[PDB]
Design a protein around this motif. Structure first.
Motif, PDB file in Angstrom:
ATOM      1  N   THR A   1     -37.944  -1.221  34.117  1.00  0.00           N
ATOM      2  CA  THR A   1     -36.633  -1.067  33.207  1.00  0.00           C
ATOM      3  C   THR A   1     -35.762  -2.216  33.216  1.00  0.00           C
ATOM      4  O   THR A   1     -35.967  -3.188  34.341  1.00  0.00           O
ATOM      5  N   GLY A   2     -35.053  -2.210  32.284  1.00  0.00           N
ATOM      6  CA  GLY A   2     -34.170  -3.470  32.178  1.00  0.00           C
ATOM      7  C   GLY A   2     -33.441  -3.644  30.900  1.00  0.00           C
ATOM      8  O   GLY A   2     -34.161  -3.283  29.800  1.00  0.00           O
ATOM      9  N   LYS A   3     -32.437  -4.413  30.773  1.00  0.00           N
ATOM     10  CA  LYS A   3     -31.869  -4.847  29.356  1.00  0.00           C
ATOM     11  C   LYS A   3     -31.537  -6.415  29.521  1.00  0.00           C
ATOM     12  O   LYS A   3     -30.904  -6.635  30.439  1.00  0.00           O
ATOM     13  N   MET A   4     -31.844  -6.946  28.691  1.00  0.00           N
ATOM     14  CA  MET A   4     -31.563  -8.533  28.405  1.00  0.00           C
ATOM     15  C   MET A   4     -30.705  -8.738  27.117  1.00  0.00           C
ATOM     16  O   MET A   4     -30.624  -7.749  26.291  1.00  0.00           O
ATOM     17  N   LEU A   5     -30.117  -9.799  27.305  1.00  0.00           N
ATOM     18  CA  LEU A   5     -29.162 -10.175  25.988  1.00  0.00           C
ATOM     19  C   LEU A   5     -29.614 -11.803  25.627  1.00  0.00           C
ATOM     20  O   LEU A   5     -29.435 -12.599  26.294  1.00  0.00           O
ATOM     21  N   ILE A   6     -30.411 -11.643  24.554  1.00  0.00           N
ATOM     22  CA  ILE A   6     -30.860 -12.820  23.902  1.00  0.00           C
ATOM     23  C   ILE A   6     -29.839 -13.317  23.249  1.00  0.00           C
ATOM     24  O   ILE A   6     -29.386 -12.579  22.147  1.00  0.00           O
ATOM     25  N   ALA A   7     -29.131 -14.675  23.100  1.00  0.00           N
ATOM     26  CA  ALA A   7     -28.119 -15.182  22.465  1.00  0.00           C
ATOM     27  C   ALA A   7     -28.513 -16.573  21.549  1.00  0.00           C
ATOM     28  O   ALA A   7     -29.353 -17.258  22.092  1.00  0.00           O
ATOM     29  N   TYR A   8     -28.198 -16.630  20.473  1.00  0.00           N
ATOM     30  CA  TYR A   8     -28.350 -17.665  19.642  1.00  0.00           C
ATOM     31  C   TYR A   8     -26.966 -18.356  19.434  1.00  0.00           C
ATOM     32  O   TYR A   8     -25.908 -17.815  18.739  1.00  0.00           O
ATOM     33  N   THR A   9     -26.873 -19.685  19.866  1.00  0.00           N
ATOM     34  CA  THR A   9     -25.484 -20.431  19.996  1.00  0.00           C
ATOM     35  C   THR A   9     -25.617 -21.423  18.601  1.00  0.00           C
ATOM     36  O   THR A   9     -26.378 -22.621  18.826  1.00  0.00           O
ATOM     37  N   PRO A  10     -25.137 -21.073  17.468  1.00  0.00           N
ATOM     38  CA  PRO A  10     -24.924 -22.251  16.449  1.00  0.00           C
ATOM     39  C   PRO A  10     -24.643 -23.581  16.957  1.00  0.00           C
ATOM     40  O   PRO A  10     -24.166 -23.875  18.113  1.00  0.00           O
TER      41      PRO A  10
ATOM     42  N   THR B   1     -19.838 -16.250  27.654  1.00  0.00           N
ATOM     43  CA  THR B   1     -19.722 -17.440  26.728  1.00  0.00           C
ATOM     44  C   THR B   1     -20.806 -17.051  25.744  1.00  0.00           C
ATOM     45  O   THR B   1     -20.589 -17.435  24.654  1.00  0.00           O
ATOM     46  N   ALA B   2     -22.250 -16.899  26.310  1.00  0.00           N
ATOM     47  CA  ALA B   2     -23.051 -16.746  25.344  1.00  0.00           C
ATOM     48  C   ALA B   2     -23.189 -15.611  24.316  1.00  0.00           C
ATOM     49  O   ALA B   2     -23.672 -15.320  23.158  1.00  0.00           O
ATOM     50  N   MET B   3     -22.386 -14.519  24.812  1.00  0.00           N
ATOM     51  CA  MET B   3     -22.409 -13.391  23.672  1.00  0.00           C
ATOM     52  C   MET B   3     -21.467 -13.473  22.712  1.00  0.00           C
ATOM     53  O   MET B   3     -21.280 -12.692  21.952  1.00  0.00           O
ATOM     54  N   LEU B   4     -20.770 -14.731  22.674  1.00  0.00           N
ATOM     55  CA  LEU B   4     -19.789 -14.817  21.725  1.00  0.00           C
ATOM     56  C   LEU B   4     -20.374 -15.190  20.515  1.00  0.00           C
ATOM     57  O   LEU B   4     -19.840 -15.788  19.219  1.00  0.00           O
ATOM     58  N   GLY B   5     -21.646 -15.762  20.578  1.00  0.00           N
ATOM     59  CA  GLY B   5     -22.514 -15.952  19.252  1.00  0.00           C
ATOM     60  C   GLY B   5     -23.342 -14.902  18.925  1.00  0.00           C
ATOM     61  O   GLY B   5     -23.166 -13.939  19.136  1.00  0.00           O
ATOM     62  N   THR B   6     -24.509 -15.223  17.922  1.00  0.00           N
ATOM     63  CA  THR B   6     -25.357 -14.249  17.388  1.00  0.00           C
ATOM     64  C   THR B   6     -26.343 -13.955  18.649  1.00  0.00           C
ATOM     65  O   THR B   6     -26.611 -14.626  19.512  1.00  0.00           O
ATOM     66  N   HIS B   7     -26.529 -12.494  18.816  1.00  0.00           N
ATOM     67  CA  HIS B   7     -27.210 -12.076  19.980  1.00  0.00           C
ATOM     68  C   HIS B   7     -27.798 -10.606  19.725  1.00  0.00           C
ATOM     69  O   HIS B   7     -27.480  -9.948  18.753  1.00  0.00           O
ATOM     70  N   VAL B   8     -28.423 -10.357  20.559  1.00  0.00           N
ATOM     71  CA  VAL B   8     -29.034  -8.896  20.584  1.00  0.00           C
ATOM     72  C   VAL B   8     -29.246  -8.372  22.072  1.00  0.00           C
ATOM     73  O   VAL B   8     -29.883  -8.992  22.923  1.00  0.00           O
ATOM     74  N   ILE B   9     -28.896  -7.105  22.367  1.00  0.00           N
ATOM     75  CA  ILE B   9     -29.198  -6.855  23.674  1.00  0.00           C
ATOM     76  C   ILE B   9     -30.510  -5.916  23.595  1.00  0.00           C
ATOM     77  O   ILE B   9     -30.687  -4.784  22.809  1.00  0.00           O
ATOM     78  N   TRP B  10     -31.332  -6.350  24.432  1.00  0.00           N
ATOM     79  CA  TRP B  10     -32.854  -5.924  24.477  1.00  0.00           C
ATOM     80  C   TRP B  10     -32.956  -4.792  25.559  1.00  0.00           C
ATOM     81  O   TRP B  10     -32.767  -5.136  26.675  1.00  0.00           O
ATOM     82  N   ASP B  11     -33.580  -3.665  25.221  1.00  0.00           N
ATOM     83  CA  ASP B  11     -33.667  -2.555  26.250  1.00  0.00           C
ATOM     84  C   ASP B  11     -35.149  -2.285  26.270  1.00  0.00           C
ATOM     85  O   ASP B  11     -35.859  -1.940  25.170  1.00  0.00           O
TER      86      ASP B  11
ATOM     87  N   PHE C   1     -15.247 -19.799   6.122  1.00  0.00           N
ATOM     88  CA  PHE C   1     -15.933 -20.336   7.343  1.00  0.00           C
ATOM     89  C   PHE C   1     -17.209 -19.923   7.742  1.00  0.00           C
ATOM     90  O   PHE C   1     -17.463 -18.664   7.684  1.00  0.00           O
ATOM     91  N   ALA C   2     -17.993 -20.517   8.288  1.00  0.00           N
ATOM     92  CA  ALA C   2     -19.273 -19.987   8.804  1.00  0.00           C
ATOM     93  C   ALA C   2     -19.943 -20.723   9.894  1.00  0.00           C
ATOM     94  O   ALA C   2     -19.458 -21.757  10.428  1.00  0.00           O
ATOM     95  N   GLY C   3     -20.873 -20.227  10.613  1.00  0.00           N
ATOM     96  CA  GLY C   3     -21.403 -20.985  11.974  1.00  0.00           C
ATOM     97  C   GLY C   3     -20.481 -20.872  13.185  1.00  0.00           C
ATOM     98  O   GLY C   3     -20.005 -21.720  13.706  1.00  0.00           O
ATOM     99  N   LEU C   4     -20.280 -19.532  13.332  1.00  0.00           N
ATOM    100  CA  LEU C   4     -19.429 -19.241  14.593  1.00  0.00           C
ATOM    101  C   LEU C   4     -19.959 -19.641  15.875  1.00  0.00           C
ATOM    102  O   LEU C   4     -20.932 -19.661  16.270  1.00  0.00           O
ATOM    103  N   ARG C   5     -19.102 -20.208  16.675  1.00  0.00           N
ATOM    104  CA  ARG C   5     -19.375 -20.474  18.223  1.00  0.00           C
ATOM    105  C   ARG C   5     -18.006 -20.610  18.929  1.00  0.00           C
ATOM    106  O   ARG C   5     -16.947 -20.090  18.519  1.00  0.00           O
TER     107      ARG C   5
END
Lengths: 225, 244, 193, 244, 244
Positions: C79-88, C99-109, E235-239
């Motif tokens: 089992t496990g949960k990951m957090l994949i984040a995308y930083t613009p 810090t990573a969670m402040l961008g676009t992300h998804v918690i994977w279960d 505004f767009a492209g948050l970080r």
């Protein structure tokens, strides 16, 4: 079978001791013929444990003042009770100017008259009184010296109750005034676990850490009565 | 009914072993009435930027753990845009959707009591003897996001029985049944708004009533994660940012 | 979707097949970092192993959202949960999960559904992006992707303490490319006989 | 959708952990049009005697396996009535229903990529240095029913990346999800009919992308069985039986 | 027509000696079309919290002043909630309402040219001789809220005549006539969105064309204050927050 006797009013509308004021002739406790009791119903276990079953409570009350000497003897003495809301001048002596009660409510009774009784409304600036306030009354740094203020809510501090011998000379007898309170028109919110340990102080839930007793009775084995 | 999804803001929570949802005192969070309010300034209702799921630290459930607690307005005061608003504004108001998650396997066992205790005032052991009027330090009354561990769970570190803690909105996480608890709490206080810094409306308690257990070989690390989302957040009385 | 070589570390002759998947295992529970990689499609790195990355090489500019699907190949009991984040763009490689969670992300279960899809939304200042390289053309960088442990990889006794994840990447329906050019590489050294 | 049954001829396959069915290039096998054909002789369409499920050898999945492949018209040329027709006739045409099966337990793990690669031409390592123009032997280009093992799966033994092998009709067998892969392939070639002996329309690749793993004590023998059935088989150009 | 009020956000500007309002290039600020956009993420339109009047530093008009300039996206990047959004987001877009105010008396005299110059690129004197390829420092190309003073106003420090600066949205402040200039600028750039940090869409120039003058005894301190409000900010492209 009726469920009427378990309503909040049935439960709380019973006068109980909440205050006791001594006015001795000689001593170190109010020996000048007057006393200032800080209004707090948290000084006696019976009444306190009941109300502490709920977190918040809104209600009107009926205060009765039973006065007599330390032997229970009824004496021909005239007293003056005065409600001093927070901000009003608290009397510093038996002949204080504050006893003029131009605005504060006062009651003049003889110990030979039946106990004075009076009705009080819900006078908190909050919507209800809190038997528990998990926080501090003021901002700033909260150092060791000021931890005295933790759990102190001014919305529950209704003022002072003052008593005196209506005179300018020492009374001929030692007095005691017991204060009873009966709640009316009661509303209550959020029930809590009932006091488990002995009470030690008024402004807090401190308990004796070396004498933590079980909630109840114990036995030898779990398989034997 | 065992599966569920909680979407709010730009965050979504999933679960396939839930046990329904509890709505504290049968009331959903709501905004302040025009007749229940006093502050005359128009409040800020940031919505999506603050009403979303924030995942706080993870705790490790050990065979000897006693339990932990988190004070709520507090846990979030230094996180995201919710924290910023809580710092810049004097008055704050909001409900919460708390989702405690902890999974194991069909061979592990144990039960956690997840409850919400309003006005959770902490007491001290009074120097052991009970003659010393000591008080809990700031680090313990408002532990922040890291939460704090209970020293005497039986009395909830406040002289009250944990056996009766179920009179409060609660839910259990019984490993053989569910792997999460969801509780929705409305704003509860004797005032329409209050400071998010000085006052903590309630506390979240996660306590092991039935000890965790398993045979050697099964993964020994069993985390307990706390995720929570504000609801119907309102702020008023704007000024500079204040930390405490 | 074609396999994205996130684990483009092993260059050994016998270890080439392991660039196709990266490890995940029981940790210490402090939101440890798992893997990291640039989201740039036509840039040297992980995306070079994908068909998308290869076709990009033939075009100067591209536009559109990208997607990366992660498939967990551990055991059923894991089992496990990951957090994949995308930083613009502009956001430096997040130092920690907070810090990573402040961008676009998804918690994977992890569960019956083995995979999860991280959508790298098209968040650009320009309508099209030319291939990003080090230096000035880093102006067209897409951002960074980073996998973190939301909770932890938990497993019973008798099950492997290490499992692998396979990343598959492709483009979305709004993806477009323009201005044909030759790929950066020519697979020939001497004349072909 | 997780359960399925494939009945064709006098054979039936069952499965309770499937992952849907893939139809290669979105086309079902069909017979040859009257305008796409050239051979003027009337073909044989044996139907039920050749369009059924044939189960070829079983392979053992090891923690170190590289992968295997099977060339298709080929695997069946020496089996059942399909093989006889493929030997007696010059021209052959048909689609296939491939069902790769491999089960484990909820405690085993691993992922197999099952794909179909049309015109799967095998290359050699060219003597290692790349200066020797060597060629793959008959035993390797047409391995028969026993299949053949990949020496360099990363490049599919043909200088092409396996990471892109998913642009071909494929499916995965992820032990925690499914225990079989089903792919239906139409007849693909630049000719309406062709020799079942000289030409192999496509190759079946079964490759472990995520290594098999389990703890000592769980059954260590995890087989991978290949079952396949021809579809819409047509043969023409009758003569004596030819083996190659 | 001489009196006016500009209300936007929670700020209001008043004036009783205005000279109408100029709308740069005859276009009002607007949001980005769905066909002019590229960034696929949903933008933030904070509205009232960023589209309001910000009053930057005050300058002193002397009988010998040469003139000043302010680069625009820039002047606000470190102020209020507009600045925060400009720092947290990669992409920014917005128009502006610029209100330059300067009052004197019926006995003072002078004329200021208030103009908007898009893509106001600064040049250097090239070491005087013109043989040294020097470049303007960061402190001069993006002076911030304090603005920067012109060294050679005749050529606008960029080799172009100020006498033609009137082909740009402008207005004059002639002390005997008006005491303020109002110019509304739409978003102008070759891109739908751009960085508020690296790029400055335009520059505000305030230059004395007719020297200030008065007789000794009349108040000698004549300030020039710049107030400006963003419009239709997106505004767009948050970080994370980036300063530069």
């Amino acid at each position: 079978h009726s469920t009427a006797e378990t309503t909040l009013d049935s439960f709380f509308s019973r006068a109980g001791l909440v205050g006791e004021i001594d006015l001795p002739l000689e001593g170190t406790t109010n020996p000048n013929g007057y006393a200032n009791w800080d209004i707090d119903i948290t000084g006696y276990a019976q009444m306190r444990r009941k109300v502490e079953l709920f977190t918040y409570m809104r209600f009107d009350a009926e205060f009765t003042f039973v006065a007599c000497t330390p032997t229970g003897q009824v004496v021909p003495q005239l007293l003056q009770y005065m409600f001093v809301p927070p901000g009003a001048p608290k009397p510093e002596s038996r002949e204080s100017l504050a006893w003029q009660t131009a605005t504060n409510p006062s009651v003049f009774v003889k110990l030979t008259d039946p106990p004075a009784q009076v009705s009080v409304p819900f006078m908190s600036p909050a919507s209800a009184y809190q038997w528990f306030y998990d926080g501090y009354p003021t901002f700033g740094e909260h150092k060791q010296e000021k931890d005295l203020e933790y759990g102190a809510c001014p919305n529950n501090m209704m003022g002072t109750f003052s008593v005196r011998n209506v005179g300018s000379s020492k009374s001929k007898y030692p007095l005691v005034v017991r204060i009873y309170m009966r709640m009316k028109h009661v509303r209550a919110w959020i029930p809590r676990p009932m006091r488990n340990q002995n009470y030690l102080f008024k402004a807090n839930p401190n308990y004796a850490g070396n004498s933590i007793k079980p909630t109840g009775t114990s036995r030898t084995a779990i398989t034997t009565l | 009914d065992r599966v569920a999804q909680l979407t709010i803001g730009n965050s979504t929570i999933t679960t396939q072993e839930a046990a329904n949802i509890i709505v504290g005192y049968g009331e959903w969070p709501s905004y302040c009435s025009d007749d229940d309010a006093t502050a005359v300034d128009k409040p800020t209702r940031p919505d999506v930027s603050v009403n979303r799921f924030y995942t706080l630290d993870t705790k490790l459930w050990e065979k000897s753990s006693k339990g932990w607690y988190w004070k709520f307005p507090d846990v979030l005061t230094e996180t995201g845009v919710f924290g910023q608003n809580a710092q810049f504004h004097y008055l704050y108001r909001s409900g919460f959707c708390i989702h405690v998650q902890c999974n194991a396997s069909k061979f592990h066992q144990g039960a956690l009591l997840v409850a919400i205790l309003p006005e959770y005032v902490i007491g001290t052991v009074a120097g052991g003897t009970g003659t010393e009027d000591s008080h809990p330090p700031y680090k313990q009354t408002q532990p922040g996001a890291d939460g704090f561990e209970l020293q005497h769970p039986y009395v909830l570190d406040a002289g009250i029985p944990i056996s009766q803690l179920t009179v409060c909105p609660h839910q259990w996480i019984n490993l053989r049944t569910n792997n999460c608890a969801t509780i929705i709490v409305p704003y509860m206080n004797t005032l329409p708004f209050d400071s998010a810094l000085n006052h903590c409306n309630f506390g979240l308690l996660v306590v092991p009533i039935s000890p965790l257990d398993f045979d050697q070989g099964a993964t020994p690390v069993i985390p307990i994660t706390i995720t929570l989302a504000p609801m119907c957040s309102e702020f008023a009385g704007l000024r500079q940012a204040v930390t405490q | 979707e074609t396999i994205l070589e996130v684990n483009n570390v092993p260059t050994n002759a016998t270890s080439l097949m392991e660039r196709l998947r990266f490890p995940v295992s029981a940790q210490a529970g402090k939101g440890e970092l798992c893997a990291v990689f640039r989201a740039d499609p036509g840039r040297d790195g992980p995306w070079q192993s994908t068909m998308l990355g290869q076709l990009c090489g033939y075009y100067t500019q591209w536009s559109g959202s990208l997607e990366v699907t992660f498939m967990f190949t551990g055991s059923f009991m894991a089992t496990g949960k990951m957090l994949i984040a995308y930083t613009p763009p502009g956001g430096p490689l997040p130092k920690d999960r907070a810090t990573a969670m402040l961008g676009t992300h998804v918690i994977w279960d992890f569960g019956l559904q083995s995979s999860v899809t991280l959508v790298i939304p098209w968040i650009s200042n320009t309508h099209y992006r030319a291939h990003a390289r080090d230096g000035v053309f880093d102006y067209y960088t897409t951002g960074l992707v980073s996998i973190w442990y939301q909770t932890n990889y938990v497993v019973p006794i008798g099950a492997p303490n290490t499992a692998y994840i396979i990343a598959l990447a492709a483009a979305q329906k709004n993806f477009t490319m323009k201005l044909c050019k030759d790929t950066s590489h020519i697979l020939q050294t001497a004349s072909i006989q």
